[PDB]
Each structure stands twice: as structure tokens, then as C-alpha cells.
């Protein structure tokens, strides 16, 4: 529970940041 | 289509008369494709509900409660509580589902037509075998006398034959883990695998 759920949440947090970062990069580019 | 439907209706009621189930099912399915699904051009047969009830009771006779319930859903709602040709199925099967088997033993003679007893009898055997299974998985030890009383085998010899037919035996006084360390070890090795070998 502890370390595995924490790792999953951390991975998801790293995911969404990229998805914003990719979205922001696209917007800066239309 | 009236001709073909009557062919299959006479054939199905003859299967009632001829007493063959494997053909009975096929007559049932084909004329179900002929009774009430998408037909709509033939006049309402006076013998629709009769065989809806017969087919439902047959389906109950071989422990097909799910399929039986689907066929119950098929027929219209105005007739479950009104049309006696299916009020006799629905009443009996409701008593079955509630567990009021004795109500079934009282109402076995409440059939609306003589073309019911043929599988009323085999329903009587279906309920008794289901009840026997229930007693076997309900009790730890069950006495000879009370078993004969509740097994619905009026002849004690019949009760003894039905007892030998199963592994559920008479009893002496007439009174009938580890750490597997492999699958869990496989689990922890799998966890390590999902941690290792990169993404």
C-alpha cells in the first residue's frame, strides 16, 4: 500500500505535468 | 405461416404426447421463431400462452432459472398476473424461489390444463433433488427418520435408493492451511520484475 500507492501517485503526477508541458509547448508553437 | 406455425404447435404438443425432450427443445426454438418474435402478421394463436408456460416449466425442470427468467421477460407484462396459462408457472416458480416447496406440493394439482402433468411430475422430481442437495449442504449429520421424513420419498426403500445414488451415507447410529511459498513467491518476484527491467 504505502510505497506502491505513493509511487503510483508520483508517476501520475509526473505524467500530468508532462501533459500540461506538452500542451503549453503546443500552444506556444498554434 | 399459420400452416407452418400450426405444424410446429401440433408437433410440440405431440412431443408432450410423444414424451421426447430433445426434439421438444427444437420444436420449442423453431416455433419460438414462429410464435411471437417479429411475426405480427399471423393472428394471435389461442395456444401461445399454453406453451409459454410449458416451456418455462420445462426450463425449470432442468435448472435453467436464468433462461427461464429471460423467457418470462419476453412475454408481456399484462399477462403474468392475469393470464392463468402463465399465472400457473409464475405462481409455482415464485413459491419455488421463496422456498415454499410445500406450497408447490399443495399446488401441483392446480394446473390449468391436462397438458401440464407430463412435466408436473418431473418438476416434482426436480424440486426433491434440489431439496436433497440443500439438506446435504445445510446439515452436518441428519437422522434416518427425519431424513426419510424430509426427503419426500414416501417409500423408505425409495429414500434408501436415492441415498445410495449419492455419496451422502447413512452413518453408524442411523444418523447421516499452509504457506504455499510458490505462488506468493511468484508474486513477489513479479513485483521485483515490475520494479526492475526499466519501464
Amino acid at each position: 500500500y504505502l510505497a506502491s500507492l505513493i509511487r503510483s501517485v508520483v508517476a501520475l503526477h509526473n505524467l500530468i505535468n508532462n501533459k500540461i508541458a506538452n500542451r503549453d509547448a503546443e500552444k506556444k508553437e498554434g | 405461416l399459420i400452416l407452418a406455425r400450426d405444424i410446429l404447435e401440433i408437433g410440440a404438443q405431440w412431443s408432450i404426447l410423444r414424451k421426447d425432450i430433445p426434439s421438444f427443445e427444437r420444436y420449442m426454438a423453431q416455433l419460438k421463431c414462429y410464435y411471437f418474435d417479429y411475426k405480427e402478421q399471423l393472428p394471435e394463436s389461442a395456444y401461445m400462452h399454453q406453451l409459454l408456460g410449458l416451456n418455462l416449466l420445462f426450463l425449470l425442470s432442468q435448472n435453467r432459472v436464468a433462461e427461464f427468467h429471460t423467457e418470462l421477460e419476453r412475454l408481456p407484462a399484462k399477462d403474468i398476473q392475469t393470464n392463468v396459462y402463465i399465472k400457473h408457472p409464475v405462481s409455482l416458480e415464485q413459491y419455488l424461489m421463496e422456498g415454499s416447496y410445500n406450497k408447490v406440493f399443495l399446488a401441483k394439482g392446480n394446473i390449468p390444463a391436462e397438458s401440464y402433468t407430463f412435466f408436473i411430475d418431473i418438476l416434482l422430481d426436480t424440486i426433491r433433488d434440489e431439496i436433497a442437495g440443500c439438506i446435504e449442504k445445510a446439515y452436518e449429520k441428519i437422522l434416518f427418520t427425519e431424513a426419510t421424513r424430509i426427503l419426500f420419498f414416501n417409500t423408505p426403500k425409495k429414500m434408501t435408493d436415492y441415498a445410495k445414488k449419492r455419496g451422502w451415507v447413512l452413518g453408524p447410529n442411523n444418523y447421516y492451511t499452509t504457506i504455499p511459498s510458490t505462488e506468493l513467491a511468484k508474486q513477489v518476484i513479479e513485483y521485483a520484475r515490475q520494479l526492475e527491467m526499466i519501464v
Partner: protein, 378 residues
């Protein structure tokens, strides 16, 4: 202004079995009428009883005479003079609280008090309306207005003075009361405030301590509540002042369930006549039963139903019935045997309870994270 609930909770709204429809309560309300003449308590009376009596208009005559006189005074001093801010206009509003609120209705005085709130600046007037329409929402059953007033008083008003909102938990004492609001914060501020009442306008101190006891024992069963309500000073003094509630509390604390049940019945009966009554009296009297039972089951592994009846009041059969309807609710962990007559308690140890709590909180978090991982990354 309008202290004794105008008896409207007990007058003709508490009829039938408690039968309070015409009695000395009628005389008390008509005394609070002939002084401070009223037709607002007659609203449900125009429909049910005391509708169109001779006195209704035989007092209407000079009630209207006096009220036009007073509002005319307020007008002429508001228009002939130009008093500003906290001024005679505020006097018109507070009179119209003693008036039209206590003449015909709140609504026009809601208009007047909102207008003077836009006019006046200080917090005393708005807290005056806070308790005015709070008690009004007790009379006419308004709650959105009351919670708006409380949020205004706390979040933004309470940056100068303080000390007044605490006794306004009465509305929360009867807002979500059947659920959490008869207690928890409804006690922790009562317990916070019981030392310093300073709000005799809303109710007498004795009734305040009775309410405090009622909310405290439901809030805290024995979570070292003795440090706050039993060992408390002012509470103990007023319990010395009120023997009935003192017995009602100490019986629970001292496990005198035989007399605690009689005290619970008595408090329930006197409880059916309050602002508290209508929402949660059923809930309070069921919950206290749960608490007393669970208190006995604790420190106990298995109990004979005979000793259950003998030491917990009475009723072997009654205790099976009540304990059954209560375990069926899932609370009061215990498993009961028949004519063997054993009541096996099955409260999980902290370890198994921790495992179950893990399963629950996990499954909730896993549901949330699964939904998140599914909406994200498609």
C-alpha cells in the same frame, strides 16, 4: 425581544399526544401579545385554531393605532430630521423588530434591516439582525438566511470584536442536528462558552447548561469527557442547581443504567417541547440508548441476558429486541446466542480494525486514482 419561542413550538404545533393546544401557554402567549401586540403568531392560527376570535380585532384596533403612531414617529424623525449612520432610522428598524416583526411579519423588516445594514457600518446592528432573523428562522423555519448571517459575522465581520457568535450555534444545534449538529462543534463551543454566558437575551443560564449537558453527552460518551463536562466547574455548579439533569448525566457516567433509563425517558419527555424537539428528539433518544448499551458492552466479553436485564434496567426480551435492532444497524459490535443466552462481543482488535480501515481508505483512494489515471492519458 422574542425569547420564549413565542410558545409556537409548543402552542398548537405540539398538539395531539402532548395535547398542548389551549392551556396556560395560550395565556402566556396572549400576555406577550397584549403587550407587544401580534398577529404573526396568528398565521397558522388563522388556519387551524384561534383564527378570528373577537379579541383578534378588538385588539387589532389599538394595536394598529399604536403601530401607526410609532412608525409615524420613526418616519417624521427620519424625514423631518437627517440623523445619519447609527441613528433614529436604526431605532425605526429595532422598533419594527419589536413592531412589524412582532406585529405582522418579518419580511418588511427584512427590507428595512437590509437597507439599514447598507446604511449603518458597525457590527452591533448586523449581529442584532443575526440573532433577530436567527430566532425568526426558528419561528418561520429559515436556515439559508441564518447561515449567510453566520458566515458574514465570522469570515469578514469578526475582524474587530468577538465573543457573540458562540451562542449562535443554536442554529447549528438545530441545523444538521439529527446527523452531527446536535453535538461535536455544537458542544465544543458550548463547552468553550459555558464558562462565560454573557448572552442572557437568547436564553437563561440554567437552560443553557441543560442544553450543554444534552449536547455534551451525545457528543462525547467517554473520550475523557470527564475532564470537560464532569470535572467542569460551572457545569457542576448548575447541575447542583438542576438535580434531574445531574442525575441523568452521572447515571451514565457511573453506569447506573437502571436509573439512567428513567432519566433518559424524563429528558425525552421534557425534550419533546423545544426548538430542539422536532428535528432530532427521536435521533437523540435512540443514540443515547446506543451509547449506553455500547458502554456496557465495552469491558465485557459475553453477557447473560438475565444479567443484561437485571444490571441494565430490565427486559431480557426487551434487551434482545433493542440490541438486535441496534446490531442490525451495524453498530455495537457483539454476537448473541439464543437459549444458551450468551452475548459474545466481536469488536475487532486495533490490528484487525486497522486492516479493515486500510482496506476502506485504500479502496477509496484507489478509486480516486483509477478515475484520475483514466481521465488523464485517455
Amino acid at each position: 425581544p422574542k425569547n420564549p419561542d413565542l410558545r409556537i413550538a409548543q402552542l398548537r404545533f405540539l398538539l395531539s399526544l402532548p395535547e398542548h393546544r389551549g392551556d396556560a401557554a395560550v395565556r402566556d402567549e396572549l400576555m406577550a401579545a397584549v403587550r407587544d401586540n401580534n398577529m404573526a403568531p396568528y398565521y397558522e392560527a388563522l388556519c387551524k385554531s384561534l383564527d378570528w376570535q373577537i379579541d383578534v380585532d378588538l385588539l387589532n384596533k389599538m394595536k394598529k393605532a399604536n403601530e401607526d403612531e410609532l412608525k409615524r414617529l420613526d418616519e417624521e424623525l427620519e424625514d423631518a430630521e437627517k440623523n445619519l449612520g447609527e441613528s433614529e432610522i436604526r431605532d425605526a428598524m429595532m422598533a419594527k423588530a419589536e413592531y412589524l416583526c412582532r406585529i405582522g411579519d418579518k419580511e418588511g423588516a427584512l427590507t428595512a434591516f437590509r437597507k439599514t445594514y447598507d446604511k449603518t457600518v458597525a457590527l452591533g446592528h448586523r449581529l442584532d439582525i443575526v440573532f433577530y432573523l436567527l430566532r425568526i428562522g426558528l419561528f418561520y423555519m429559515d436556515n439559508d438566511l441564518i447561515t449567510r448571517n453566520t458566515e458574514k459575522a465570522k469570515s469578514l465581520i469578526e475582524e474587530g470584536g468577538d465573543w457573540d457568535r458562540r451562542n449562535r450555534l443554536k442554529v447549528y444545534q438545530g441545523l444538521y442536528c439529527v446527523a452531527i449538529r446536535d453535538f461535536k462543534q455544537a458542544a465544543e463551543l458550548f463547552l468553550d462558552t459555558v464558562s462565560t454566558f454573557t448572552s442572557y437575551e437568547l436564553m437563561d443560564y440554567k437552560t443553557f447548561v441543560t442544553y450543554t449537558v444534552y449536547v455534551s453527552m451525545i457528543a462525547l460518551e467517554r473520550p475523557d469527557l470527564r475532564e470537560k463536562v464532569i470535572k467542569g466547574a460551572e457545569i457542576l455548579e448548575v447541575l447542583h442547581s438542576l438535580p434531574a439533569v445531574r442525575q441523568y448525566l452521572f447515571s451514565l457516567y457511573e453506569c447506573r443504567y437502571s436509573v439512567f433509563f428513567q432519566s433518559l425517558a424524563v429528558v425525552e419527555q421534557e425534550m419533546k417541547k423545544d426548538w430542539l424537539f422536532a428535528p432530532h428528539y427521536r435521533y437523540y433518544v435512540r443514540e443515547m440508548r446506543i451509547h449506553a448499551y455500547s458502554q456496557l458492552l465495552e469491558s465485557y466479553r459475553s453477557l447473560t441476558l438475565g444479567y443484561m436485564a437485571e444490571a441494565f434496567g430490565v427486559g431480557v426480551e426487551f434487551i434482545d429486541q433493542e440490541l438486535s435492532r441496534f446490531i442490525a444497524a451495524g453498530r455495537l459490535h457483539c454476537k448473541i446466542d439464543k437459549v444458551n443466552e450468551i452475548v459474545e462481543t466481536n469488536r475487532p482488535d486495533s490490528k484487525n480494525w486497522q486492516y479493515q480501515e486500510t482496506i476502506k481508505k485504500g479502496d477509496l483512494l484507489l478509486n480516486r486514482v483509477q478515475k484520475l489515471s483514466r481521465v488523464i492519458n485517455m
